[PDB]
């Protein structure tokens, strides 16, 4: 299937309580492999997956210096954005950055992205061609022209189409026994009557990887998303994920409703009945 | 692996 | 500035079974800003030795965190997750349901 390497940057300003806090994490598909916390004692990039540990000391020193450098730039950014919007120094603000590359089944470059957010809302993001910018407001227009004079998009594209695909391939090979497994979900069905004549049909999917999955509740064989409840996919904590979907029905009529499981680790999509 | 380029908003 | 309330799910790593060690999870997602307080409760009192995920966020920029600890379920004890966030006037308590 497909694969992705993504990095996430966060920096929260704390007026009156010191420097802003910087947190950075890196992901390979739904598997986190590194982290940095500017508030920790480590003051170093740290492994968070077994397959990344084999990288030598030159790797960890280089990732620490840059995440330290990106730390400070996002510190300056909080002041710059505070000026762009004429905000006061008293409030706490959030700045977020995400970038990464996507590759297909043949592990060849498929998609790149580089985005930036301020206080949870879109600010600036690299367009799909990796040559142009999407600016959200007039302050992001200043950033856009600033980065156009600095040729930022051209230098990001060289990384996202080169370095990021090649190091993602390296991780995928070096961690094949973990990153390339496909845990098929284990599915069962709970029953919990609500009310005399209506009762919940909850379709369960447990212990699957990767996180992507599709659960649908049908009527007679055709779907009905009227009484369907659907929780967000959640981590089980041991590397796998969980999800369920529920519906209410009239009683004695519980076996017109079917549940359909779609997952890459399933050769056949599953149907369940009661 | 991180990208080295430092960018300022 | 947008502010978003955390969604809270309380569940076990594996199917619950009385007397067998499991992991109690409380998953906090979809909230903004990042600052949050999460405690796991053993019959209303704060459990010790609870760890949490590294901070991350989804495509819509809202954060998620996993708080978890090892426990051994019984039938009489109550387990809950207490969440405090800037969008909440008061800590919210979500009880653990064995079926959910």
Author numbering:
A (entry chain A): 1 to 274
B (entry chain C): 1 to 9
C (entry chain B): 0 to 99
Give the text the authors published on this PDB structure.
Here we report crystal structures of one public and one private TCR (YLQ7 and RLQ3, respectively) from COVID-19 CPs in complex with HLA-A*02:01 and two S protein epitopes, corresponding to residues 269–277 (YLQPRTFLL; designated YLQ) and 1000–1008 (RLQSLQTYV; designated RLQ), that were found to elicit almost universal CD8+ T cell responses in HLA-A2*02:01+ CPs but not in healthy donors. Public TCRs are observed in multiple unrelated individuals, whereas private TCRs are distinct between individuals. For its part, the RLQ epitope, unlike YLQ, is conserved across human and zoonotic sarbecoviruses and is therefore a potential candidate for inclusion in a pan-sarbecovirus vaccine. The YLQ epitope has been identified as immunodominant in multiple independent studies, including one involving the BNT162b2 mRNA vaccine.
We determined the structures of the RLQ–HLA-A2 and YLQ–HLA-A2 complexes to 2.81 and 2.07 Å resolution, respectively. Clear and continuous electron density extending the entire length of both MHC-bound peptides allowed confident identification of all peptide atoms. Both RLQ–HLA-A2 and YLQ–HLA-A2 crystals contain two complex molecules in the asymmetric unit. The conformation of the RLQ peptide in the two RLQ–HLA-A2 complexes is nearly identical, with a root-mean-square difference (r.m.s.d.) of 0.14 Å for α-carbon atoms and 0.68 Å for all atoms. The RLQ and YLQ peptides are bound in conventional orientation with the side chains of P2 Leu and P9 Val/Leu accommodated in pockets B and F, respectively, of the peptide-binding groove. In the RLQ–HLA-A2 complex, the solvent-exposed side chains of P1 Arg, P4 Ser, P5 Leu, P6 Gln, and P8 Tyr project away from the peptide-binding groove and compose a moderately featured surface for potential interactions with TCR. In the unliganded RLQ–HLA-A2 structure, the RLQ epitope is not very prominent, which is reflected in the relatively small amount of peptide solvent-accessible surface (322 Å2) that TCR RLQ3 buries upon binding RLQ–HLA-A2. Of note, all 12 human and zoonotic betacoronavirus lineage B (SARS-like coronavirus, or sarbecovirus) sequences are fully conserved at the RLQ epitope site, whereas outside of that lineage, most alphacoronavirus and betacoronavirus sequences differ at 4–5 positions within the epitope site.
